[PDB]
PDB file of all heavy atoms in Angstrom:
ATOM      1  N   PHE A   1       0.826  -1.189   0.010  1.00  0.00           N
ATOM      2  CA  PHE A   1      -0.006  -0.012  -0.002  1.00  0.00           C
ATOM      3  C   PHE A   1       0.858   1.236   0.004  1.00  0.00           C
ATOM      4  O   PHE A   1       1.932   1.283   0.594  1.00  0.00           O
ATOM      5  CB  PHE A   1      -0.916   0.036   1.233  1.00  0.00           C
ATOM      6  CG  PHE A   1      -1.862  -1.114   1.319  1.00  0.00           C
ATOM      7  CD1 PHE A   1      -1.562  -2.214   2.084  1.00  0.00           C
ATOM      8  CD2 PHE A   1      -3.067  -1.097   0.616  1.00  0.00           C
ATOM      9  CE1 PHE A   1      -2.435  -3.288   2.166  1.00  0.00           C
ATOM     10  CE2 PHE A   1      -3.953  -2.154   0.698  1.00  0.00           C
ATOM     11  CZ  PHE A   1      -3.641  -3.238   1.494  1.00  0.00           C
ATOM     12  N   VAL A   2       0.380   2.253  -0.679  1.00  0.00           N
ATOM     13  CA  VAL A   2       1.055   3.527  -0.689  1.00  0.00           C
ATOM     14  C   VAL A   2       0.038   4.631  -0.423  1.00  0.00           C
ATOM     15  O   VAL A   2      -1.053   4.634  -0.978  1.00  0.00           O
ATOM     16  CB  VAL A   2       1.812   3.766  -2.032  1.00  0.00           C
ATOM     17  CG1 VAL A   2       2.571   2.514  -2.450  1.00  0.00           C
ATOM     18  CG2 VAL A   2       0.895   4.219  -3.142  1.00  0.00           C
ATOM     19  N   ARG A   3       0.342   5.546   0.494  1.00  0.00           N
ATOM     20  CA  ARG A   3      -0.626   6.545   0.937  1.00  0.00           C
ATOM     21  C   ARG A   3      -0.276   7.918   0.392  1.00  0.00           C
ATOM     22  O   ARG A   3       0.772   8.455   0.746  1.00  0.00           O
ATOM     23  CB  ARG A   3      -0.724   6.546   2.458  1.00  0.00           C
ATOM     24  CG  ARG A   3      -1.853   7.397   2.987  1.00  0.00           C
ATOM     25  CD  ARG A   3      -2.330   6.892   4.342  1.00  0.00           C
ATOM     26  NE  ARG A   3      -2.926   5.556   4.239  1.00  0.00           N
ATOM     27  CZ  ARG A   3      -2.817   4.610   5.173  1.00  0.00           C
ATOM     28  NH1 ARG A   3      -2.116   4.821   6.269  1.00  0.00           N
ATOM     29  NH2 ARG A   3      -3.417   3.435   5.012  1.00  0.00           N
ATOM     30  N   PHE A   4      -1.137   8.467  -0.418  1.00  0.00           N
ATOM     31  CA  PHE A   4      -0.872   9.749  -1.073  1.00  0.00           C
ATOM     32  C   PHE A   4      -1.551  10.909  -0.383  1.00  0.00           C
ATOM     33  O   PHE A   4      -2.403  10.736   0.508  1.00  0.00           O
ATOM     34  CB  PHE A   4      -1.326   9.666  -2.535  1.00  0.00           C
ATOM     35  CG  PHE A   4      -0.261   9.145  -3.461  1.00  0.00           C
ATOM     36  CD1 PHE A   4       0.460   8.009  -3.170  1.00  0.00           C
ATOM     37  CD2 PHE A   4       0.010   9.828  -4.646  1.00  0.00           C
ATOM     38  CE1 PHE A   4       1.451   7.558  -4.022  1.00  0.00           C
ATOM     39  CE2 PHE A   4       0.979   9.364  -5.513  1.00  0.00           C
ATOM     40  CZ  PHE A   4       1.707   8.238  -5.198  1.00  0.00           C
ATOM     41  N   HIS A   5      -1.167  12.114  -0.797  1.00  0.00           N
ATOM     42  CA  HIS A   5      -1.720  13.373  -0.336  1.00  0.00           C
ATOM     43  C   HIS A   5      -3.212  13.421  -0.557  1.00  0.00           C
ATOM     44  O   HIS A   5      -3.996  13.536   0.382  1.00  0.00           O
ATOM     45  CB  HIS A   5      -1.020  14.520  -1.078  1.00  0.00           C
ATOM     46  CG  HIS A   5      -1.713  15.851  -1.016  1.00  0.00           C
ATOM     47  ND1 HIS A   5      -2.301  16.422  -2.130  1.00  0.00           N
ATOM     48  CD2 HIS A   5      -1.935  16.704   0.005  1.00  0.00           C
ATOM     49  CE1 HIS A   5      -2.821  17.581  -1.799  1.00  0.00           C
ATOM     50  NE2 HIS A   5      -2.611  17.781  -0.531  1.00  0.00           N
ATOM     51  N   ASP A   6      -3.626  13.326  -1.815  1.00  0.00           N
ATOM     52  CA  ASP A   6      -5.020  13.453  -2.186  1.00  0.00           C
ATOM     53  C   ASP A   6      -5.322  12.506  -3.332  1.00  0.00           C
ATOM     54  O   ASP A   6      -4.382  11.918  -3.909  1.00  0.00           O
ATOM     55  CB  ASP A   6      -5.298  14.897  -2.592  1.00  0.00           C
ATOM     56  CG  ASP A   6      -6.778  15.180  -2.853  1.00  0.00           C
ATOM     57  OD1 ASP A   6      -7.200  15.013  -4.015  1.00  0.00           O
ATOM     58  OD2 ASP A   6      -7.497  15.530  -1.911  1.00  0.00           O
ATOM     59  N   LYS A   7      -6.575  12.333  -3.669  1.00  0.00           N
ATOM     60  CA  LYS A   7      -6.968  11.480  -4.784  1.00  0.00           C
ATOM     61  C   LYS A   7      -6.305  11.994  -6.064  1.00  0.00           C
ATOM     62  O   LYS A   7      -5.928  11.208  -6.923  1.00  0.00           O
ATOM     63  CB  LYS A   7      -8.470  11.450  -4.955  1.00  0.00           C
ATOM     64  CG  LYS A   7      -8.920  10.499  -6.068  1.00  0.00           C
ATOM     65  CD  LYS A   7     -10.383  10.670  -6.424  1.00  0.00           C
ATOM     66  CE  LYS A   7     -10.795   9.747  -7.564  1.00  0.00           C
ATOM     67  NZ  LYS A   7     -12.131  10.084  -8.088  1.00  0.00           N
ATOM     68  N   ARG A   8      -6.145  13.315  -6.150  1.00  0.00           N
ATOM     69  CA  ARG A   8      -5.540  13.946  -7.314  1.00  0.00           C
ATOM     70  C   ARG A   8      -4.172  13.331  -7.605  1.00  0.00           C
ATOM     71  O   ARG A   8      -3.809  13.162  -8.765  1.00  0.00           O
ATOM     72  CB  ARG A   8      -5.409  15.459  -7.096  1.00  0.00           C
ATOM     73  CG  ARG A   8      -4.246  15.884  -6.206  1.00  0.00           C
ATOM     74  CD  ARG A   8      -4.191  17.388  -6.000  1.00  0.00           C
ATOM     75  NE  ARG A   8      -4.470  18.127  -7.231  1.00  0.00           N
ATOM     76  CZ  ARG A   8      -3.619  18.960  -7.805  1.00  0.00           C
ATOM     77  NH1 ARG A   8      -2.400  19.126  -7.321  1.00  0.00           N
ATOM     78  NH2 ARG A   8      -3.982  19.623  -8.900  1.00  0.00           N
ATOM     79  N   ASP A   9      -3.442  13.029  -6.559  1.00  0.00           N
ATOM     80  CA  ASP A   9      -2.090  12.487  -6.691  1.00  0.00           C
ATOM     81  C   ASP A   9      -2.173  10.991  -7.018  1.00  0.00           C
ATOM     82  O   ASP A   9      -1.353  10.446  -7.769  1.00  0.00           O
ATOM     83  CB  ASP A   9      -1.290  12.665  -5.390  1.00  0.00           C
ATOM     84  CG  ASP A   9      -1.148  14.120  -4.983  1.00  0.00           C
ATOM     85  OD1 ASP A   9      -0.152  14.754  -5.382  1.00  0.00           O
ATOM     86  OD2 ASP A   9      -2.015  14.620  -4.214  1.00  0.00           O
ATOM     87  N   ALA A  10      -3.185  10.332  -6.467  1.00  0.00           N
ATOM     88  CA  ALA A  10      -3.341   8.900  -6.587  1.00  0.00           C
ATOM     89  C   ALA A  10      -3.799   8.518  -7.986  1.00  0.00           C
ATOM     90  O   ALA A  10      -3.432   7.464  -8.494  1.00  0.00           O
ATOM     91  CB  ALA A  10      -4.315   8.372  -5.545  1.00  0.00           C
ATOM     92  N   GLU A  11      -4.590   9.392  -8.610  1.00  0.00           N
ATOM     93  CA  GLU A  11      -5.145   9.140  -9.931  1.00  0.00           C
ATOM     94  C   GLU A  11      -4.033   8.903 -10.948  1.00  0.00           C
ATOM     95  O   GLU A  11      -4.056   7.900 -11.668  1.00  0.00           O
ATOM     96  CB  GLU A  11      -6.027  10.307 -10.383  1.00  0.00           C
ATOM     97  CG  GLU A  11      -7.286  10.483  -9.564  1.00  0.00           C
ATOM     98  CD  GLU A  11      -8.114  11.661 -10.001  1.00  0.00           C
ATOM     99  OE1 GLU A  11      -7.765  12.811  -9.651  1.00  0.00           O
ATOM    100  OE2 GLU A  11      -9.103  11.462 -10.723  1.00  0.00           O
ATOM    101  N   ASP A  12      -3.054   9.792 -10.968  1.00  0.00           N
ATOM    102  CA  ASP A  12      -1.923   9.655 -11.861  1.00  0.00           C
ATOM    103  C   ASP A  12      -1.139   8.394 -11.552  1.00  0.00           C
ATOM    104  O   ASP A  12      -0.682   7.694 -12.448  1.00  0.00           O
ATOM    105  CB  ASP A  12      -1.000  10.854 -11.770  1.00  0.00           C
ATOM    106  CG  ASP A  12      -1.585  12.113 -12.379  1.00  0.00           C
ATOM    107  OD1 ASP A  12      -1.759  12.176 -13.614  1.00  0.00           O
ATOM    108  OD2 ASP A  12      -1.879  13.062 -11.636  1.00  0.00           O
ATOM    109  N   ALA A  13      -1.008   8.074 -10.260  1.00  0.00           N
ATOM    110  CA  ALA A  13      -0.199   6.935  -9.846  1.00  0.00           C
ATOM    111  C   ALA A  13      -0.854   5.613 -10.162  1.00  0.00           C
ATOM    112  O   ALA A  13      -0.232   4.753 -10.800  1.00  0.00           O
ATOM    113  CB  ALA A  13       0.102   7.050  -8.352  1.00  0.00           C
ATOM    114  N   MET A  14      -2.102   5.431  -9.733  1.00  0.00           N
ATOM    115  CA  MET A  14      -2.823   4.170  -9.918  1.00  0.00           C
ATOM    116  C   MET A  14      -3.003   3.856 -11.399  1.00  0.00           C
ATOM    117  O   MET A  14      -2.898   2.720 -11.814  1.00  0.00           O
ATOM    118  CB  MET A  14      -4.179   4.227  -9.204  1.00  0.00           C
ATOM    119  CG  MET A  14      -5.078   5.341  -9.728  1.00  0.00           C
ATOM    120  SD  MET A  14      -6.287   4.751 -10.935  1.00  0.00           S
ATOM    121  CE  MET A  14      -6.576   6.259 -11.860  1.00  0.00           C
ATOM    122  N   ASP A  15      -3.266   4.891 -12.197  1.00  0.00           N
ATOM    123  CA  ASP A  15      -3.457   4.717 -13.622  1.00  0.00           C
ATOM    124  C   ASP A  15      -2.153   4.383 -14.321  1.00  0.00           C
ATOM    125  O   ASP A  15      -2.075   3.513 -15.179  1.00  0.00           O
ATOM    126  CB  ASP A  15      -4.037   5.987 -14.248  1.00  0.00           C
ATOM    127  CG  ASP A  15      -4.274   5.854 -15.743  1.00  0.00           C
ATOM    128  OD1 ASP A  15      -5.335   5.302 -16.144  1.00  0.00           O
ATOM    129  OD2 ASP A  15      -3.409   6.297 -16.506  1.00  0.00           O
ATOM    130  N   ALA A  16      -1.099   5.069 -13.903  1.00  0.00           N
ATOM    131  CA  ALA A  16       0.202   4.936 -14.560  1.00  0.00           C
ATOM    132  C   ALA A  16       0.884   3.616 -14.224  1.00  0.00           C
ATOM    133  O   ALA A  16       1.300   2.859 -15.106  1.00  0.00           O
ATOM    134  CB  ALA A  16       1.121   6.059 -14.172  1.00  0.00           C
ATOM    135  N   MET A  17       1.002   3.353 -12.939  1.00  0.00           N
ATOM    136  CA  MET A  17       1.846   2.276 -12.449  1.00  0.00           C
ATOM    137  C   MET A  17       1.160   0.929 -12.474  1.00  0.00           C
ATOM    138  O   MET A  17       1.744  -0.083 -12.079  1.00  0.00           O
ATOM    139  CB  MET A  17       2.339   2.612 -11.043  1.00  0.00           C
ATOM    140  CG  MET A  17       3.214   3.857 -10.993  1.00  0.00           C
ATOM    141  SD  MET A  17       4.047   4.047  -9.397  1.00  0.00           S
ATOM    142  CE  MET A  17       4.926   2.503  -9.302  1.00  0.00           C
ATOM    143  N   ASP A  18      -0.062   0.898 -12.938  1.00  0.00           N
ATOM    144  CA  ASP A  18      -0.680  -0.365 -13.323  1.00  0.00           C
ATOM    145  C   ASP A  18      -0.002  -0.849 -14.588  1.00  0.00           C
ATOM    146  O   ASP A  18      -0.420  -0.531 -15.711  1.00  0.00           O
ATOM    147  CB  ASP A  18      -2.191  -0.212 -13.511  1.00  0.00           C
ATOM    148  CG  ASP A  18      -2.835  -1.451 -14.100  1.00  0.00           C
ATOM    149  OD1 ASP A  18      -2.861  -2.509 -13.410  1.00  0.00           O
ATOM    150  OD2 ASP A  18      -3.339  -1.405 -15.255  1.00  0.00           O
ATOM    151  N   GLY A  19       1.100  -1.568 -14.409  1.00  0.00           N
ATOM    152  CA  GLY A  19       1.975  -1.917 -15.508  1.00  0.00           C
ATOM    153  C   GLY A  19       3.339  -1.267 -15.364  1.00  0.00           C
ATOM    154  O   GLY A  19       4.051  -1.064 -16.358  1.00  0.00           O
ATOM    155  N   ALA A  20       3.710  -0.934 -14.139  1.00  0.00           N
ATOM    156  CA  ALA A  20       5.007  -0.341 -13.841  1.00  0.00           C
ATOM    157  C   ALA A  20       5.966  -1.396 -13.335  1.00  0.00           C
ATOM    158  O   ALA A  20       5.643  -2.143 -12.433  1.00  0.00           O
ATOM    159  CB  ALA A  20       4.866   0.732 -12.786  1.00  0.00           C
ATOM    160  N   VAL A  21       7.166  -1.436 -13.889  1.00  0.00           N
ATOM    161  CA  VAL A  21       8.139  -2.431 -13.480  1.00  0.00           C
ATOM    162  C   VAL A  21       9.096  -1.868 -12.433  1.00  0.00           C
ATOM    163  O   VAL A  21       9.859  -0.958 -12.716  1.00  0.00           O
ATOM    164  CB  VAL A  21       8.956  -2.955 -14.668  1.00  0.00           C
ATOM    165  CG1 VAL A  21       9.764  -4.170 -14.257  1.00  0.00           C
ATOM    166  CG2 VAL A  21       8.048  -3.286 -15.850  1.00  0.00           C
ATOM    167  N   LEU A  22       9.013  -2.384 -11.224  1.00  0.00           N
ATOM    168  CA  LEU A  22       9.897  -1.907 -10.144  1.00  0.00           C
ATOM    169  C   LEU A  22      11.238  -2.654 -10.207  1.00  0.00           C
ATOM    170  O   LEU A  22      12.236  -2.220  -9.627  1.00  0.00           O
ATOM    171  CB  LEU A  22       9.223  -1.997  -8.746  1.00  0.00           C
ATOM    172  CG  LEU A  22       9.213  -3.339  -7.981  1.00  0.00           C
ATOM    173  CD1 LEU A  22       8.858  -4.524  -8.883  1.00  0.00           C
ATOM    174  CD2 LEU A  22      10.541  -3.589  -7.281  1.00  0.00           C
ATOM    175  N   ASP A  23      11.237  -3.783 -10.922  1.00  0.00           N
ATOM    176  CA  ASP A  23      12.452  -4.579 -11.115  1.00  0.00           C
ATOM    177  C   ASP A  23      12.240  -5.561 -12.262  1.00  0.00           C
ATOM    178  O   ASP A  23      12.837  -5.410 -13.323  1.00  0.00           O
ATOM    179  CB  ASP A  23      12.792  -5.353  -9.832  1.00  0.00           C
ATOM    180  CG  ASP A  23      13.990  -6.270 -10.032  1.00  0.00           C
ATOM    181  OD1 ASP A  23      15.132  -5.798  -9.901  1.00  0.00           O
ATOM    182  OD2 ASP A  23      13.783  -7.472 -10.300  1.00  0.00           O
ATOM    183  N   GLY A  24      11.406  -6.551 -12.017  1.00  0.00           N
ATOM    184  CA  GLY A  24      11.072  -7.517 -13.051  1.00  0.00           C
ATOM    185  C   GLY A  24       9.608  -7.895 -12.986  1.00  0.00           C
ATOM    186  O   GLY A  24       9.230  -9.045 -13.220  1.00  0.00           O
ATOM    187  N   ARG A  25       8.797  -6.909 -12.643  1.00  0.00           N
ATOM    188  CA  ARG A  25       7.362  -7.100 -12.473  1.00  0.00           C
ATOM    189  C   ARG A  25       6.630  -5.787 -12.666  1.00  0.00           C
ATOM    190  O   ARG A  25       6.995  -4.767 -12.034  1.00  0.00           O
ATOM    191  CB  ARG A  25       7.094  -7.610 -11.059  1.00  0.00           C
ATOM    192  CG  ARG A  25       5.659  -7.407 -10.573  1.00  0.00           C
ATOM    193  CD  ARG A  25       4.747  -8.537 -11.034  1.00  0.00           C
ATOM    194  NE  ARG A  25       4.088  -8.278 -12.311  1.00  0.00           N
ATOM    195  CZ  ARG A  25       3.943  -9.216 -13.259  1.00  0.00           C
ATOM    196  NH1 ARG A  25       4.495 -10.408 -13.118  1.00  0.00           N
ATOM    197  NH2 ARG A  25       3.223  -8.936 -14.347  1.00  0.00           N
ATOM    198  N   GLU A  26       5.637  -5.772 -13.523  1.00  0.00           N
ATOM    199  CA  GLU A  26       4.703  -4.649 -13.587  1.00  0.00           C
ATOM    200  C   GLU A  26       3.738  -4.756 -12.422  1.00  0.00           C
ATOM    201  O   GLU A  26       2.950  -5.714 -12.371  1.00  0.00           O
ATOM    202  CB  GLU A  26       3.956  -4.605 -14.901  1.00  0.00           C
ATOM    203  CG  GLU A  26       4.844  -4.776 -16.133  1.00  0.00           C
ATOM    204  CD  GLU A  26       4.035  -4.790 -17.430  1.00  0.00           C
ATOM    205  OE1 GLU A  26       3.300  -5.752 -17.668  1.00  0.00           O
ATOM    206  OE2 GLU A  26       4.182  -3.833 -18.212  1.00  0.00           O
ATOM    207  N   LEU A  27       3.815  -3.830 -11.500  1.00  0.00           N
ATOM    208  CA  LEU A  27       2.924  -3.819 -10.346  1.00  0.00           C
ATOM    209  C   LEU A  27       1.482  -3.629 -10.771  1.00  0.00           C
ATOM    210  O   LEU A  27       1.187  -2.920 -11.726  1.00  0.00           O
ATOM    211  CB  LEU A  27       3.308  -2.737  -9.331  1.00  0.00           C
ATOM    212  CG  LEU A  27       4.647  -2.919  -8.590  1.00  0.00           C
ATOM    213  CD1 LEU A  27       4.850  -4.377  -8.205  1.00  0.00           C
ATOM    214  CD2 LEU A  27       5.801  -2.437  -9.444  1.00  0.00           C
ATOM    215  N   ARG A  28       0.578  -4.275 -10.049  1.00  0.00           N
ATOM    216  CA  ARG A  28      -0.849  -4.090 -10.250  1.00  0.00           C
ATOM    217  C   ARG A  28      -1.322  -2.997  -9.311  1.00  0.00           C
ATOM    218  O   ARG A  28      -1.755  -3.279  -8.199  1.00  0.00           O
ATOM    219  CB  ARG A  28      -1.601  -5.392  -9.995  1.00  0.00           C
ATOM    220  CG  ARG A  28      -3.090  -5.313 -10.299  1.00  0.00           C
ATOM    221  CD  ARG A  28      -3.340  -5.135 -11.774  1.00  0.00           C
ATOM    222  NE  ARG A  28      -2.802  -6.240 -12.553  1.00  0.00           N
ATOM    223  CZ  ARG A  28      -2.371  -6.152 -13.816  1.00  0.00           C
ATOM    224  NH1 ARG A  28      -2.421  -4.990 -14.455  1.00  0.00           N
ATOM    225  NH2 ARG A  28      -1.905  -7.228 -14.430  1.00  0.00           N
ATOM    226  N   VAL A  29      -1.212  -1.761  -9.745  1.00  0.00           N
ATOM    227  CA  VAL A  29      -1.575  -0.627  -8.900  1.00  0.00           C
ATOM    228  C   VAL A  29      -2.992  -0.151  -9.147  1.00  0.00           C
ATOM    229  O   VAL A  29      -3.329   0.262 -10.266  1.00  0.00           O
ATOM    230  CB  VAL A  29      -0.586   0.552  -9.103  1.00  0.00           C
ATOM    231  CG1 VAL A  29      -0.864   1.664  -8.083  1.00  0.00           C
ATOM    232  CG2 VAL A  29       0.856   0.076  -8.961  1.00  0.00           C
ATOM    233  N   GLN A  30      -3.825  -0.236  -8.132  1.00  0.00           N
ATOM    234  CA  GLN A  30      -5.194   0.216  -8.203  1.00  0.00           C
ATOM    235  C   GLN A  30      -5.470   1.152  -7.025  1.00  0.00           C
ATOM    236  O   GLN A  30      -4.680   1.194  -6.084  1.00  0.00           O
ATOM    237  CB  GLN A  30      -6.154  -0.982  -8.156  1.00  0.00           C
ATOM    238  CG  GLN A  30      -5.836  -2.056  -9.188  1.00  0.00           C
ATOM    239  CD  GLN A  30      -6.823  -3.194  -9.176  1.00  0.00           C
ATOM    240  OE1 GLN A  30      -6.458  -4.356  -9.452  1.00  0.00           O
ATOM    241  NE2 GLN A  30      -8.072  -2.913  -8.895  1.00  0.00           N
ATOM    242  N   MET A  31      -6.558   1.908  -7.086  1.00  0.00           N
ATOM    243  CA  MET A  31      -6.893   2.800  -5.993  1.00  0.00           C
ATOM    244  C   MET A  31      -7.560   2.009  -4.866  1.00  0.00           C
ATOM    245  O   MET A  31      -8.632   1.439  -5.034  1.00  0.00           O
ATOM    246  CB  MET A  31      -7.817   3.927  -6.468  1.00  0.00           C
ATOM    247  CG  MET A  31      -8.282   4.855  -5.339  1.00  0.00           C
ATOM    248  SD  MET A  31      -9.185   6.290  -5.931  1.00  0.00           S
ATOM    249  CE  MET A  31      -7.861   7.177  -6.689  1.00  0.00           C
ATOM    250  N   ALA A  32      -6.908   2.019  -3.713  1.00  0.00           N
ATOM    251  CA  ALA A  32      -7.412   1.298  -2.555  1.00  0.00           C
ATOM    252  C   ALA A  32      -8.060   2.253  -1.572  1.00  0.00           C
ATOM    253  O   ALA A  32      -7.419   2.755  -0.651  1.00  0.00           O
ATOM    254  CB  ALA A  32      -6.280   0.518  -1.899  1.00  0.00           C
ATOM    255  N   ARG A  33      -9.326   2.543  -1.787  1.00  0.00           N
ATOM    256  CA  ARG A  33     -10.050   3.495  -0.966  1.00  0.00           C
ATOM    257  C   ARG A  33     -10.752   2.791   0.201  1.00  0.00           C
ATOM    258  O   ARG A  33     -11.797   3.223   0.672  1.00  0.00           O
ATOM    259  CB  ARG A  33     -11.083   4.243  -1.805  1.00  0.00           C
ATOM    260  CG  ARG A  33     -12.099   3.344  -2.478  1.00  0.00           C
ATOM    261  CD  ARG A  33     -13.156   4.148  -3.200  1.00  0.00           C
ATOM    262  NE  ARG A  33     -13.879   5.036  -2.265  1.00  0.00           N
ATOM    263  CZ  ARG A  33     -14.806   5.897  -2.625  1.00  0.00           C
ATOM    264  NH1 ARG A  33     -15.151   6.009  -3.909  1.00  0.00           N
ATOM    265  NH2 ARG A  33     -15.388   6.650  -1.709  1.00  0.00           N
ATOM    266  N   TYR A  34     -10.149   1.708   0.674  1.00  0.00           N
ATOM    267  CA  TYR A  34     -10.699   0.946   1.784  1.00  0.00           C
ATOM    268  C   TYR A  34     -10.800   1.813   3.038  1.00  0.00           C
ATOM    269  O   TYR A  34      -9.905   2.593   3.348  1.00  0.00           O
ATOM    270  CB  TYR A  34      -9.850  -0.301   2.068  1.00  0.00           C
ATOM    271  CG  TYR A  34      -8.423  -0.034   2.446  1.00  0.00           C
ATOM    272  CD1 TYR A  34      -8.047   0.092   3.791  1.00  0.00           C
ATOM    273  CD2 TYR A  34      -7.434   0.127   1.476  1.00  0.00           C
ATOM    274  CE1 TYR A  34      -6.727   0.337   4.132  1.00  0.00           C
ATOM    275  CE2 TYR A  34      -6.128   0.370   1.818  1.00  0.00           C
ATOM    276  CZ  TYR A  34      -5.776   0.480   3.149  1.00  0.00           C
ATOM    277  OH  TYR A  34      -4.460   0.727   3.503  1.00  0.00           O
ATOM    278  N   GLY A  35     -11.905   1.693   3.730  1.00  0.00           N
ATOM    279  CA  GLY A  35     -12.106   2.441   4.953  1.00  0.00           C
ATOM    280  C   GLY A  35     -11.705   1.629   6.160  1.00  0.00           C
ATOM    281  O   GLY A  35     -12.257   0.558   6.396  1.00  0.00           O
ATOM    282  N   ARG A  36     -10.736   2.153   6.922  1.00  0.00           N
ATOM    283  CA  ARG A  36     -10.229   1.481   8.114  1.00  0.00           C
ATOM    284  C   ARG A  36      -9.496   0.198   7.781  1.00  0.00           C
ATOM    285  O   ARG A  36     -10.108  -0.815   7.454  1.00  0.00           O
ATOM    286  CB  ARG A  36     -11.355   1.165   9.105  1.00  0.00           C
ATOM    287  CG  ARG A  36     -11.822   2.353   9.933  1.00  0.00           C
ATOM    288  CD  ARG A  36     -12.725   1.872  11.042  1.00  0.00           C
ATOM    289  NE  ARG A  36     -12.123   0.775  11.798  1.00  0.00           N
ATOM    290  CZ  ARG A  36     -12.737  -0.393  12.023  1.00  0.00           C
ATOM    291  NH1 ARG A  36     -13.979  -0.601  11.594  1.00  0.00           N
ATOM    292  NH2 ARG A  36     -12.086  -1.362  12.671  1.00  0.00           N
TER     293      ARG A  36
END
């Protein structure tokens, strides 16, 4: 999990890094708006 400032920041991140390679894997990055 990664915790951002606002949804505005998360939108670019979740959309972009869904398919981002941190080494040898494109991370499955989605918006996790889970409460508690």
Side-chain angles (χ1 to χ4, degrees):
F1 300 96
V2 316
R3 189 153 295 145
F4 271 48
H5 163 248
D6 186 270
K7 184 192 178 190
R8 79 182 317 241
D9 301 269
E11 293 178 281
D12 289 292
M14 60 98 206
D15 181 83
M17 297 191 57
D18 171 67
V21 191
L22 82 315
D23 176 85
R25 160 85 269 140
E26 312 178 292
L27 292 319
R28 185 67 60 208
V29 186
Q30 308 182 212
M31 176 173 290
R33 58 174 302 176
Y34 61 93
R36 281 191 50 232

